[PDB]
Structures are given as C-alpha cells and as structure tokens.
Amino acid sequence: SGTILIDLSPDDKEFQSVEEEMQSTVREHRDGGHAGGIFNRYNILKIQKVCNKKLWERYTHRRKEVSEENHNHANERMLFHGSPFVNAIIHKGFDERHAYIGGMFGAGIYFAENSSKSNQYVYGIGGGTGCPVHKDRSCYICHRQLLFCRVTLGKSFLQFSMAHSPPGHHSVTGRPLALAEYVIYRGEQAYPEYLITYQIMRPE
Ligand SMILES: CCOc1ccc(-c2nnc([C@H]3C[C@H](NC(=O)c4ccc5ncccc5n4)C3)n2-c2ccccc2F)nc1
Ligand SMILES: [Zn+2]
Numbered sequence: 001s002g003t004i005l006i007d008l009s010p011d012d013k014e015f016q017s018v019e020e021e022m023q024s025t026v027r028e029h030r031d032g033g034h035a036g037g038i039f040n041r042y043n044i045l046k047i048q049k050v051c052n053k054k055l056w057e058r059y060t061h062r063r064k065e066v067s068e069e070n071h072n073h074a075n076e077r078m079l080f081h082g083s084p085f086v087n088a089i090i091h092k093g094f095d096e097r098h099a100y101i102g103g104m105f106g107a108g109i110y111f112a113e114n115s116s117k118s119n120q121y122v123y124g125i126g127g128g129t130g131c132p133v134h135k136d137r138s139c140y141i142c143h144r145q146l147l148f149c150r151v152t153l154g155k156s157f158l159q160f161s162m163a164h165s166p167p168g169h170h171s172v173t174g175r176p177l178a179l180a181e182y183v184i185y186r187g188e189q190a191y192p193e194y195l196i197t198y199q200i201m202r203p204e
Contacts, residue, residue, distance in 0.1 A: 106162030
C-alpha cells in the first residue's frame with residue numbers, strides 16, 4: 001500500500017476545522033445511545049490527513065464523469081463515515097463489494113452529516129456487539145475511528161424507509177427525529193480525507 005498519514009497538530013486550523021465539525025454535528029438520537037453510547041461531546045485524540053495517489057486519482061476521475069452527467073457539478077460534500085472496516089478503507093479504498101445487502105437503502109456505502117450518526121455504525125450495524133474488549137456500545141474507554149470523506153453525491157435520489165443508483169442518479173439521500181443519511185454504490189464516489197481517532201466522553 002502507498003497510503004500515508006499526516007498527523008495534524010491540534011493548533012492546526014485544518015485540525016480545529018474537523019475538530020469543530022465533529023463536535024458541533026452531534027445530536028440526540030431516537031436510540032437514546034443504545035447504538036453509539038450516551039455522550040454530548042467527544043475526546044478528540046488524533047486527526048490524520050490520509051494521502052494516497054492511486055485513491056485520489058480514482059476519486060477525481062469519477063468526480064469528473066459525474067459532473068458531466070449532472071450539469072457540470074460534482075455535488076461534493078464532506079461527510080462522516082462509520083464502519084468496522086476503516087483500517088482497510090485507508091489502504092485499499094472504499095469498496096462496494098463489501099456493502100451490506102439488507103440495508104434500508106440496499107447494498108451501498110452509508111455516510112452522514114452528523115458524526116453522532118456515523119458513530120453508531122463503528123462497531124457494526126446498530127452498534128453491533130459494542131467494543132471488542134468490553135462488549136459495550138457505550139464504552140468511554142475503547143478508542144473509536146471515524147472517516148471524514150470527500151463524497152461525490154452527483155444527482156441524489158430522495159427515498160424513505162435496491163443494488164445500484166436509480167437510473168440517471170449517482171447517490172441516494174434518505175431521512176428515516178429525521179436525520180440525513182447518504183448512500184453511494186461505487187467506492188470511487190468517496191475519498192477518506194481525514195482519519196479521526198477519538199473516545200465518546202462520559203457526561204456529568
Ligand atoms: C441501518 C443500516 O445502516 C447501515 C449503515 C452503514 C452501512 C455501511 N456503510 N458502509 C459500510 C461498509 C461496507 C464498506 N466496506 C468497505 O469499503 C471496505 C473496503 C475494503 C475492505 N477490505 C476488507 C474487508 C472489508 C472491506 N470493506 C463500508 N457499511 C457497512 C457494511 C457492512 C457492515 C457494516 C457496515 F456499517 N451499512 C448499513
Ligand atoms: Zn471497551
């Protein structure tokens with residue numbers, strides 16, 4: 001793998017920018033923290049810029065194609081991604097071939113504009129078994145990782161609660177509190193720009 005991490009200084013505005021987006025986009029969930037745990041804030045341990053030429057070229061190339069298919073606009077968004085496969089993703093890239101076939105929006109790659117949403121998917125679907133060490137979805141000890149990714153949404157189909165994008169579309173926007181999820185069915189419509197290492201913070 002030709003993938004490379006840049007540790008960002010916490011005084012670095014680029015860090016603070018992602019730091020802020022992460023903290024500010026937290027919300028009260030339907031769950032009551034059953035999936036991602038109980039917290040109002042994160043402990044932000046490490047933000048690393050992911051650098052990989054093969055993956056950057058794969059993305060921009062697709063981004064161009066999509067623009068041409070969508071009135072010369074990529075419809076590019078910074079979105080959080082949670083999943084068990086973050087360590088794989090930063091090396092091999094996002095890969096649709098590992099999508100969960102029984103998602104509410106079919107076999108795609110789910111993003112969110114709310115850190116606290118993506119957080120839910122970190123230890124699997126609906127938080128899964130929780131952390132590997134304590135089997136606790138609300139673990140304040142075990143360090144978690146999210147991705148803050150450049151995502152090419154293109155022309156996004158609006159759905160509510162499938163295998164590819166609907167015809168003439170590049171992404172799906174859902175809203176099942178209604179919060180926004182986003183789905184792609186092609187790994188190269190997303191680049192994982194920042195690797196965020198963090199804990200959820202116990203409130204009091
Ligand atoms: C309420 C149900 O809601 C959701 C929300 C999000 C997702 C989701 N979104 N993305 C994923 C992951 C599959 C995709 N995986 C990769 O890009 C990838 C890339 C390289 C890999 N290499 C080795 C092994 C696995 C690898 N996986 C990201 N997943 C995902 C897929 C399978 C299991 C868990 C997941 F979160 N699925 C369902
Ligand atoms: Zn734990």
